Symmetry: D2
Subunit: 364 residues, 4 copies
């Protein structure tokens, strides 16, 4: 991309951790350039924030509607917008952006219902604009390594996919942890095993902090994949003592792979009957696709900020290919798009249906 | 001191070809808690006698079968007082029954038997003949398991919310069940030790035979449980967890903190208070509870292993036998060991999981009768 | 700092070193890149600089030309970072200072103590700062260690064991001593500022023979005033090691240990108590260790964050020096740190070249 | 099979008040390699007799002192054949000497003695009376130490460049030395097993007494060594490494790869080939060398501990004794155990480090005479 994509944010204002990483990622390597935004419901502190960031005073709109309409009149108007507002606003804001002919990057989750998600998807195709979803963990290079090893048959036939995102920060929309954290490792499995398809699943959710009912702060999701493989997802915000605990273990007939988000730069490779191995980010034995995004030599620890930059970069590549109508270039870019968004919403929906019905199996 | 005279002991099976006879002997004979004076070591008379004589066992006490041993030993004044059964799982029920009927304390290699009805029969006989029936859930012999029990009882974890268990190795990546009873019940007993008051209300199980030829016996299973009171429990049993050397772990999650133990690192115990720095407790340290230090056989820092745990277990079996022989109920209750009750529950747990699994993972009441329609 | 500092880069063109420098300086718009001498090849330099959005007339052919022409601009650079070969650090830093520009020089300030003394002379004379890239000190937990040690949580310090031994090369006056040994040495400086080296000895080897007389491995034993002992293992031939930079501070009451490959955790081991692991971003950390958090605990930050934090401190020192006032409340690897880094290497080489005899530190 | 009849054994010390007597007995009596038939267990005859009797030792063979035992036992047809000395370090020399002169094989708790001259005397006596002198560098009993030896000999590490050793615990944070001989020599013997052909050319040592009252005995020390051939070696000995439970580690660094072992995790061995994924080898796996599998007492995955290592050690002492009794030199050379030579070298290393440390860390020749001026 010869030039930075004219960008803007909705939300992600003062003291927003989420907004900060979005900006770091998007502006990394000047892939995007923040030229406008609706940073706060509070108009005064919205412009005060936008200006410290160097955003022109007249482009620190009071809301997303005014921003979209006014920007449409500028030859230098925004081309894409990132949404970091509350979950219940995601559907309406993403809908507007698309109708405005803008590329979108929406913070998880896309929306609350499958219907809404399918509506947004029809619009993205109608307006020919991408809708990326922030499954930022997929930006870590080793996730690519796993994908390549599995496709190359290094694990043999896949038998199980054990996932979990269980932290304890809350030991003291249709769901809470299922949508807030469960979907992250679920998307990682999508990247690692793109051909695996869910046939049916059951879920058991609890509200250990009672006042949270009906929203769950803990959940178990058991899945049956077409072909015989099994899947398990443990979602939690009450796993006391856990700093994050997002892990995915893929088990095959020949070996297993295991990745942990708190140790992003190492990937466990366990061949049955052989010594366990630890693969390191940036090493020459890695598949080429797992090396392209390295920003520093192996041994030097990269982090989540790098992963998000890698993710935002792919978003940029997708938008660009979509704009130049370069069918070939778009097919070569893998990113969390509208389909991943739809699936995230559907998985949660199926899980809630099962859980509300005493954990019955439900077709996917 | 407490076992002044070594308990006259015998073994059924565990001969030359046995893969478990060694740990049983090392554990039982340690500190001379038991003394091997007889046995029915082999289905092959000559090989059994050869083996037995190599152990210093009276040639005339190397019986051809468990029945002849029980019958003849019962006529001797210095006849065996206890017997350890290490024969194939299918024989555990009948041998344990014969031993009990013969007035012998029993130590049975898990499982105790295959059905709950058989299990209840052994329990009935055990009470009738006033003889114990220890079951070999030997991982419970590790000191830190007691530490966890003490910590949980002291409210260190606040209210218990989840008990996550697993015993998933991958050696087989290439009765009524396989992994559920072979490995699943080990961590299950560990939870019993750490949380004696927790009662299972109902559970569901999903089991698979990844190596198809094994069906209907499962080489992988997931068990989700609901404890009375709201807590949840999960058990992952597997012999196809490729790359895993054992993988037996248990994590107890409470409202205030969690604790986790892994059998491959038996001398450490993770203690994670939410909002505080994670902690690692070490076997043999002064900050441990006395009940978690009494079994130490060497100073902290030096690693102890499964053999020590098994010796610790057999020692409790001996204490239980002595208290029972003394008709001391209160004393007996002070001995924390996997006895007839744990044996029954281990069989029940497998039976309920199998019932759930055979019925597409529907919820089944842990106790009581489950019905399709009623 | 209301306005970004007008910044330039010498070298670090089409260079991961240049990359992390830029990522760090430009983050949160602490600095703004307006000029540079990116390459020996003007064509490649201009192309590079232009890709970065730098005016073509400000993509200078050499550092002197840049310093000369920029002095004539109201929007001229105020600071310059050097990422050229270690052999050019001295002369370029000297030129920068005489030009009245703040400087950020890559790891080795220079080769000799004389040179280091001269640069310090100039920094004071032109009242400009000279930061050195001991970036690992940017990690928050290093601050945590410093505070814990100062509050006496380790009791009396007895030993300081450091190492930076990787194996990438298993197949100036030194090599690893200056390239990797000085990194954990600076970490100890931040953790134990009051510690003073009395004397030390060093043993160095050239396992890959052709590297002689430069060492690819070295052991440095030190005696601190007060009785504490210090050990430094520098290596590029520790086969199998991805980096292996670690520091363990041992006190009479407890120890703490940090490893650069797991920057977000700090081991705290109180004798007779359960070992503890401190996590970046947690509420039990000292306030000073939390100020630089850019994201919640549990999310792994990395070396890029540490460098960002380092560059912010450089900016703060430059500002305070400019507004002339504040400079005392900002800790950072400056000229003194640079000088000491040079002296430690010089003392180590002297000892090693003389069969590991003890040598007074100063 | 190779020890048809249990070796008539005895202990000097290791009584009820000893904290090392238990591991010696467990190791020696395991598999009936040895049989305890006599002892000089306590300087207090009454307590020694009581103790000994509790072990099945005839009251008449519970001697009041090692001298009496050696003299009386030598006059018995069923007299002891070997003796383990577990008394204070200062007595090792004289007791070992007396045992050897009394025609007894010896197993001495380290160190063998305090001076090289004494160590050479014991070596001379050992050859004269043709009796072995094993030294308890028990950590070498762990299987993975043999694996490392095999890997190094097979060239897995390429050319050895560095040998980094340490044994630094913090239990004491609050003869001629303390930690050098007490813990320093353990990993040193581990390196001897892994790198038998490596020869020390010269070394320097810096030692400190952080708890001043201990001086001149050190509670911390650093030893830097130059091996013949160019490789370097480092040993950190410490009793004041606050927070460390044991901390015994050895990392061997070669031109191609490195390997590392930690006594607190004895069942794993790190294998790091430069440029390749780090590897972790596990005790009991089929990819190990048979010499590293032969001592397995249970399947991999189950953790073995220091007691197994010690039993493995004692078994080798037994094999060495038998080979010596058969006068089979070639057979004796196949038995890899810490014998008199390892004993002498353990004493020499300490003596050289002390000489250097006492002289402000000057380089001292490992072999030969060191001089201020010459
Ligand atoms: Mg019945
Ligand atoms: Mg099925
Ligand atoms: Mg002599
Ligand atoms: Mg001194």
């Amino acid at each position: 991309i010869p030039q930075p994509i004219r960008w803007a944010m909705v939300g992600g204002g003062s003291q927003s951790q989420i907004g900060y990483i979005h900006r770091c990622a998007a502006l990394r390597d000047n892939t995007f350039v923040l030229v406008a935004g609706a940073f706060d419901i509070d108009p005064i502190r919205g412009s005060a924030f936008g200006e410290q960031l160097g955003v022109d005073s007249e482009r620190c709109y009071a809301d997303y509607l005014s921003m979209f309409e006014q920007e449409a009149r500028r030859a230098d108007g925004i081309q894409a917008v990132s949404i970091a507002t509350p979950n219940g606003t995601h559907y309406s804001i993403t809908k507007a952006a698309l109708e405005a002919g803008l590329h979108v990057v929406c913070e998880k989750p896309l929306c609350f219902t499958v219907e809404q998600a399918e509506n947004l998807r029809e619009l993205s195709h109608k307006h020919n604009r991408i809708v990326g979803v922030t499954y930022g963990y997929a930006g870590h290079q080793l996730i690519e390594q796993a994908r390549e090893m599995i496709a190359a048959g290094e694990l043999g036939d896949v038998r199980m996919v054990h996932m979990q995102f269980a932290h304890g920060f809350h030991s003291a929309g249709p769901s809470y942890v299922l949508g807030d954290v469960g979907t992250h490792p679920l998307y990682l499995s999508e990247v690692m095993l793109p051909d695996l398809k869910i046939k049916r699943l059951m879920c058991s959710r609890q509200s250990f902090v009672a006042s949270r009912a009906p929203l769950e702060d803990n959940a178990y999701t058991l899945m049956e994949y077409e072909g015989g493989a099994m899947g398990m997802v443990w979602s939690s915000a009450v796993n006391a003592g856990s700093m994050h605990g997002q892990k995915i273990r893929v088990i095959g007939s020949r070996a297993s792979l295991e990745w942990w988000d708190e140790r992003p730069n190492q990937l466990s490779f366990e061949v049955q009957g052989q010594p366990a191995q630890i693969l390191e980010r940036g090493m020459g034995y890695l598949h080429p696709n797992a090396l392209i995004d390295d920003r520093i030599g192996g041994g030097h620890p990269e982090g989540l900020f790098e992963a998000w930059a890698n993710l935002y970069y792919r978003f940029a590549l997708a938008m660009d290919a979509t704009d130049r109508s370069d069918t070939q270039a778009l097919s070569a870019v893998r990113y969390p798009g509208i389909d991943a968004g739809v699936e995230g919403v559907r998985w949660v929906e199926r899980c809630v249906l099962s859980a509300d019905n005493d954990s019955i199996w439900v077709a996917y």
